[PDB]
Amino acid sequence: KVFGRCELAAAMKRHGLDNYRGYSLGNWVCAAKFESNFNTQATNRNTDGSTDYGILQINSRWWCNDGRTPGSRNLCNIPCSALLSSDITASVNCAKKIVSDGNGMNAWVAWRNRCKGTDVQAWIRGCRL
Incomplete structure (x- = not known):
């Protein structure tokens, strides 16, 4: 499934990620955007033979x-x-x-290189939460 930005934001919130370990919701949405383009079926193989799966x-x-x-x-x-x-x-x-x-x-x-230190609140702007 390919999530819309606000739809994912709402689901993450519902699952207790907002402020989890001090990380605001915008950080989690930003990370999902850059890691998988909000696609739960994304997979990527690494050089060591391991594979990365899902939205995160x-x-x-x-x-x-x-x-x-x-x-x-x-x-x-x-x-x-x-x-x-x-x-x-x-x-x-x-x-x-x-x-x-x-x-x-x-x-x-992707969080470290593209989200960390940016205005992550932009990722939840306009959402009904």
Whole structure:
């Protein structure tokens, strides 16, 4: 499913991401925009053989099981395909573990290079929340 900006903002809010670990909602929407263009079915393979999945492009090296990433962890305890659903619950649940890992939102490279330090509130402008 391809989310609209405000529709995703509302879903993330509903799932308790607004201000999660001190990160305002605009940060999460900005990260989803640049990581997957708001497409829950996005996948990208990395050089190390791991793959990034879903709206928040969560990596198979540590967070989900895809059965093809030799000696990887599954810290979220889910099959990576769960991250591609139209229902963002699994993606959100996993994102909360990642952001609590010590590096905050820096774990998402697109957040760090394209969102961090920008007016992220622009991502939720005009939405009914």
